[PDB]
Design a protein around this ligand. Structure first.
Ligand SMILES: CC(C)(C)c1cc(-c2ccc(S(=O)(=O)CCO)cc2)cc([C@@H]2C[C@@H]2c2ccccn2)c1
Length: 228
C-alpha cells in the first residue's frame, strides 16, 4: 500500500469504464485499419497544441492478456520491443506491480526532444460476473517526483496510456486462444510542436508500434506454457 494506491485505482477504473467502450461512435475518426487492427483518433488541440486522443483495437492469436500485459509492463524486456525511446531509468519501485519510470524519447525533426515521468502499474480486474471475461490492464500515467532528472534538451510530455486485454479461449492450445486488446493513449507533448508532425507520427507509428509489439509477444511466447 504505497502512496499511489488510490490514484492508481481511479485511473484504472476510469479506463475500465470509458476506454473499453466500443466506438458506432462517429466521435472517433477511424484513421487506419490493417486486418485485425483498427486505429482511431479525435482531433483535439489545447492552447494550440495537438492532444489528439488515440484509441486502437486489435485481436492477436495465440497469446493471453496476462502475457501481453506482462511483456508490456516488464522493464527487463522493455528494450527488445520498444522503438520510441532513447533511454529509460526506473525512478522508484512502488510495489511488485508498480514502478515510476523516467524516459527520453527519440527526437522527431524538427520538434524538441521530449521526456516523460510516469507511474506504470499492471493489474488484474476479476470477471465482474461469471459471464464477463476477466481483464488485464497496464496503465502508464504521468506523476510528479522529487528525484525527477534534469534534462535541459527535453520538453516534459504528460501521458495517460492503457493497454487493456481480454482473453477468449475456444487441453488448451495456443491455436485456441485470442487476446482482444484495446489500447488508448492521451499524450500531451507539453509545449509547442508542429501539428502536422504530431499527426503524421501518430498515424504512421502507432499501427507499427502495436503490430510490432504484439508480434514480439507471439514470438516470445510460442511453444512456452500458456500463462493465463
Ligand atoms: C505523437 C504520439 C504518437 C501521440 C506520441 C506517443 C508517445 C508514446 C508514449 C508512451 C507509449 S507507452 O505505450 O506508454 C510504452 C512506453 O513508452 C507509447 C507512445 C510519446 C510521444 C512523445 C511526446 C513525444 C514526441 C514529441 C514530438 C515529436 C515526437 N514525439 C508522442
Amino acid at each position: 500500500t504505497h502512496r499511489f494506491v488510490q490514484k492508481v485505482e481511479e485511473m484504472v477504473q476510469n479506463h475500465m469504464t470509458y476506454s473499453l467502450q466500443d466506438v458506432g461512435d462517429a466521435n472517433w475518426q477511424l484513421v487506419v485499419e490493417e486486418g485485425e487492427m483498427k486505429v482511431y483518433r479525435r482531433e483535439v488541440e489545447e492552447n494550440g497544441i495537438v492532444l489528439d486522443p488515440l484509441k486502437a483495437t486489435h485481436a492477436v492469436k495465440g497469446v493471453t492478456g496476462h502475457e501481453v500485459c506482462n511483456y508490456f509492463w516488464n522493464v527487463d524486456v522493455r528494450n527488445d520491443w520498444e522503438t520510441t525511446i532513447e533511454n529509460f531509468h526506473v525512478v522508484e519501485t512502488l510495489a511488485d506491480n508498480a514502478i515510476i519510470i523516467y524516459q527520453t524519447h527519440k527526437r522527431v525533426w524538427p520538434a524538441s526532444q521530449r521526456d516523460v515521468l510516469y507511474l506504470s502499474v499492471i493489474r488484474k480486474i476479476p470477471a465482474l460476473t461469471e459471464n464477463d471475461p476477466e481483464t488485464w490492464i497496464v496503465c502508464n500515467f504521468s506523476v510528479d517526483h522529487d528525484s525527477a532528472p534534469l534534462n535541459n534538451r527535453c520538453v516534459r510530455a504528460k501521458i495517460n496510456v492503457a493497454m487493456i486485454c481480454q482473453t477468449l479461449v475456444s487441453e488448451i492450445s495456443r491455436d485456441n486462444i485470442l487476446c482482444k486488446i484495446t489500447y488508448v493513449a492521451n499524450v500531451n507533448p507539453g509545449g509547442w510542436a508542429p501539428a502536422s508532425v504530431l499527426r503524421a507520427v501518430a498515424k504512421r507509428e502507432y499501427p507499427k508500434f502495436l503490430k510490432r509489439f504484439t508480434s514480439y509477444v507471439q514470438e516470445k511466447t510460442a511453444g512456452k506454457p500458456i500463462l493465463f
